[PDB]
Amino acid sequence: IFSVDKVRADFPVLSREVNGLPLAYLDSAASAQKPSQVIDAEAEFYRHGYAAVHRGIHTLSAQATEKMENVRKRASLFINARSAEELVFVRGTTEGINLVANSWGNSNVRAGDNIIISQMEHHANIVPWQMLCARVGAELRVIPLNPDGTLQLETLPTLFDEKTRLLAITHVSNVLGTENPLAEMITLAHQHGAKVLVDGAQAVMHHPVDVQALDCDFYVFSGHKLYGPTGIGILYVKEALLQEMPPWEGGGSMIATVSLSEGTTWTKAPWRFEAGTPNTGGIIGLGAALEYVSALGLNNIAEYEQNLMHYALSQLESVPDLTLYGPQNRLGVIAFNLGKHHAYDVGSFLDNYGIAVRTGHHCAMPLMAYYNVPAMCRASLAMYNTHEEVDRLVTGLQRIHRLLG
Amino acid sequence: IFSVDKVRADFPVLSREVNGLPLAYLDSAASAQKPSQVIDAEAEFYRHGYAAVHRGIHTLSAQATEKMENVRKRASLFINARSAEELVFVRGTTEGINLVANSWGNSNVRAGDNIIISQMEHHANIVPWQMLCARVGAELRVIPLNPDGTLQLETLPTLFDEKTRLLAITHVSNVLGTENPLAEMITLAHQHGAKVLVDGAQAVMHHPVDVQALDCDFYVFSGHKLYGPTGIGILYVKEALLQEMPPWEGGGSMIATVSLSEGTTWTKAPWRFEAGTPNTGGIIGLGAALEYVSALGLNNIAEYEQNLMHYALSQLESVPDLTLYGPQNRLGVIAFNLGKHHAYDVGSFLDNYGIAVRTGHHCAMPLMAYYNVPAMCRASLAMYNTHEEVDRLVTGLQRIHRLLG
Ligand SMILES: *Cc1c(COP(=O)(O)O)cnc(C)c1O
Ligand SMILES: *Cc1c(COP(=O)(O)O)cnc(C)c1O
C-alpha cells in the first residue's frame, strides 16, 4: 500500500511557502516536482563522475557512456519496448514529435495524402503536423469531440481512407484527463496501413504503459512530467520503422564517416538520431526518476490517485456554479471554470491562497474553442497531493465565488 | 591575479581517484568539469523554486519565468549582444547550427548557390551544411589548411563569388587550438553580401567574446564546455536576421494562435524558436556558470592558461619522437602523436596513469585526413589544470615511449 506522507517527505519543494502560506502545488500536469533521489543523482554525477560520453578512452568517459546506455535500457523496460535500441533521447515530447514529423514524415507523406489528429491534442501534437502538411501538400484531418470530452469515434470511417498515412493521437488529455482507446484505434489504423504516433506525456506517470501491447509505431513522453529533470524525453520507434528513417539533426556522433569530397555516411539507429553532446545530466536524473516511480509501483500510484480524484470530484459538488470539462473517469487533471469569472481571476485568487493551479488555454486552443471558452482552470492531483489540499481548493473556490459573485 | 589552488577547490571532481591514482583531467575541450556553485544552483532550483515556466499565473511559475529571462539577459551581456532577444536557448552548439541551417538556410540558399566552410571544422559545423546543400542543390566549398594548422587565406578570392550565401567558420579549433581571424574574414564575407555563422564552442571559455565587434550574423556555443550543465547552449542571431527567420520546431509556446481550420500563426523572435518546455534546470545552471567565469575574469583566465600552455610546450620538447599539430600560439588544446604508436594505445597508457586525454578523430575527420593520420591525442589545459599535471603528462609520454619503442 501507498503512504502519501512518506512520499511527500522525499519532495523538498512541498515544504515551501508561497505568499506567506503553505504551498499546495496542483500543477504537476504542467511539470512535476522532483524527489531528492532524482535531484541528488544528477548532482552526484556532476560531483564525482562527470565526463564527455562518446565511448571515450579514459575511465570517467567510458563509465559515463555506460551510465547513459543503462538509462536507455531501463527506459525501454519501463515502457516494455522489445529493445533498448528502439529508444531515442530527445529534449522532450515536443522535440520527439518534431523528429518523427521530419525524419519519417518527409519521406512517407506525399501530396494528396492525409494525416489524422484529434481535436483534444496538445499543440505539440498539432503544429508539427500542420508544418508537415504545408511542406508536402497533404491534408490534416481531425477527430471531433463529444460534449463529455471523449472522441466521436463514429466519424473514423469518414476520416480513414487509403491515403491516410498517420494517426497522431493523445494517450491521455492534458486538459480533460480523458484516456483514449489506443489499442482499438491502432488496430483500425493498421488495417489501412497507417502508422500511429501516440503522445504519452500525460500517461506514463499515472499507470503502467506497454508499447508492445498497444502496438503503436511511435510513443513519446517527457522526463519533467515523470518527476524527472527538465531537458530530457524519450521517443520510442518500432525497430523496423526506425532503421529506415533518415537523420534529422546532423553533426558529431551520428556519423559513420565524414568526407568533404566523398560525402558523409550515417551510423545505426538510435545513435543516428542523437547529434552532438547528449544531455547526460538529464539522462542520469531521468534514470533515477524511473527507479523512484518503479519503487513506489505505478499500480499503487494509480490506486492512490484514483481515490484522490474521486474524493475531489465528490467535494467539488459543493461549489456553486462550478463547470467541469471532461469525463467522470478523468485521470490526473480537473479542468473547470467558476461561474462567469475569468479563469485568470480564479487562478490569481487561488495563488493568493498559496494554491498553484494553471489557467489559460493549456496549449490546447482547438479544445478551448470546441467548448466556446477562451480559457479554463486546471488542477492536477499527483501522487504527492493530499485530501487536505483538495479541501483548500474547494474552500477557496467557495470564498472566491462569494467575494466575486 | 589568478589562484589555481583556490579555483580547483571549487571543483569536486578534481579530488577523484581513477584506477587508484589521482585524476589529471586533461579533457575539458570535450567537456568541462563543473564548480559546485553551478551544481548547487541547479540543485537548489529543483529543491526550492521548481515550476513550469510559461508566464504561468502562480508564484513559483512566474518566478521561474523571470529566472530564465534573466539568464537570457546575462548571456547576452556575456557576449555583448545588443539585445537579450537576439539569444535563442538550444541544446548546444550542434542544435544551434542545425536550427540556422534549416530555418535560415532553407529560405536563403537556392540551387546554384555556394556555402563556404573550412577544412578544420568540427562535424557539427560540416554535416548540417552538407545536408542543406543536398536539400536545395547548392555547393559546399572548403578553405584549405596550411601545414602549421592555419587557414590558407590566399584561396578566399577563388571561393567567394556573388553566389556565396554563407561562411561558416570556427572561432577556435577544438583540435589545433588555432584561432581564426574572424573580424577580417567577416568584413570580406559581407562585401559579397554573405552571412557568417561563427562556431564559438571553443572560444567563450578562453577569452572575452564580443559579437558586436566581430559583426558576425550568427554565433553558437555550448554550456557544458563553459563549466556549465549539459543540455543547454546559446545561439546568437542579429535581430534583423532573426525576426525574418521562420520557425524550425513547432509546438507549444512558439505559437500566437492555433486553429484547425484557420491555420496557425507564430509569436515573436527568440520565443518563436523555442518549442515545448525549455531545459529550465540547464538554463539556471548556465547562468551560474556565467557568473562564476565572470567573477574569475576571462582576462585572468586567459593569462593563467597562456602561461600554462607555454610551460607545457616547453616541457614537451623533452619527449622523444613527439609530433605536434597546429600553431605555436594554440589556445587550450595540444594535439599530438607519439612516435609511430597509435593514439588509442598512448591514451590507454595515459588513462592507466590516471591522466584523462582524448584520442581518435575528435569529430574532425577532414582535419585528420589533411594530416594523413587516422587519429590524434589531445590534451586540454583548462583554468583548473596545474604545472604538476603537465609534468605527469610529459613523464607519462616518456615512459610510454621507452616501454613501447
Ligand atoms: C564540442 C564542439 C562542438 C559540439 O558542441 P556540442 O555541445 O556537442 O553540441 C562544435 N564545435 C566545436 C568547435 C566544439 O569544440
Ligand atoms: C506537456 C505535454 C506536452 C509537451 O511536452 P514538453 O515536455 O513541453 O515537450 C505534449 N503533450 C502533452 C499531452 C503534454 O501534457
From Swiss-Prot, chains A, B:
Self-association state and partner proteins as the record states: Homodimer. Interacts with SufE and the SufBCD complex composed of SufB, SufC and SufD. The interaction with SufE is required to mediate the direct transfer of the sulfur atom from the S-sulfanylcysteine.
Name the UniProt record assigns to this protein: Cysteine desulfurase
Primary localisation category: cytoplasm
Annotated metabolic or biological route of this protein: Cofactor biosynthesis; iron-sulfur cluster biosynthesis
GO BP field: cysteine metabolic process; iron-sulfur cluster assembly; selenium compound metabolic process; sulfur compound metabolic process
EC number: 2.8.1.7, 3.13.1.-, 4.4.1.16
Species per Swiss-Prot/TrEMBL record: Escherichia coli (strain K12)
MF terms in GO: cysteine desulfurase activity; cysteine sulfinate desulfinase activity; hydrolase activity; protein homodimerization activity; pyridoxal phosphate binding; selenocysteine lyase activity
Active site (catalytic residues): C363
Catalytic activity: (sulfur carrier)-H + L-cysteine = (sulfur carrier)-SH + L-alanine; L-selenocysteine + AH2 = hydrogenselenide + L-alanine + A + H(+); 3-sulfino-L-alanine + H2O = sulfite + L-alanine + H(+)
Cofactors named for this entry: pyridoxal 5'-phosphate
Gene Ontology cellular component annotations, sorted alphabetically: cytoplasm
Keyword Secreted: no
Induction summary: Suf operon is under both the Fe-dependent Fur repressor and the oxidative stress dependent OxyR activator.
Family: Belongs to the class-V pyridoxal-phosphate-dependent aminotransferase family. Csd subfamily.
NCBIfam families cross-referenced by the UniProt entry: PRK09295.1, sufS
Keywords: Cytoplasm, Hydrolase, Lyase, Pyridoxal phosphate, Transferase
InterPro entries linked to this entry: Aminotrans_V_dom, Aminotrans_V_PyrdxlP_BS, Cys_dSase_SufS, PyrdxlP-dep_Trfase, PyrdxlP-dep_Trfase_major, PyrdxlP-dep_Trfase_small
Consequence recorded when altering H122A: Loss of function; possibly due to destabilization of PLP in the active site
Cellular compartment(s): Cytoplasm
Gene this chain is encoded by: sufS
Role according to the record: Cysteine desulfurases mobilize the sulfur from L-cysteine to yield L-alanine, an essential step in sulfur metabolism for biosynthesis of a variety of sulfur-containing biomolecules. Component of the suf operon, which is activated and required under specific conditions such as oxidative stress and iron limitation. Acts as a potent selenocysteine lyase in vitro, that mobilizes selenium from L-selenocysteine. Selenocysteine lyase activity is however unsure in vivo. Can also desulfinate L-cysteine sulfinate (3-sulfino-L-alanine).
Stated regulation of activity: Displays a strong preference for selenocysteine as a substrate in vitro and is only very slightly active using cysteine. The interactions with SufE and the SufBCD complex act synergistically to enhance, up to 50-fold, its cysteine desulfurase activity.
Domain of life according to the entry: Bacteria
Residues where N6-(pyridoxal phosphate)lysine is found: K225
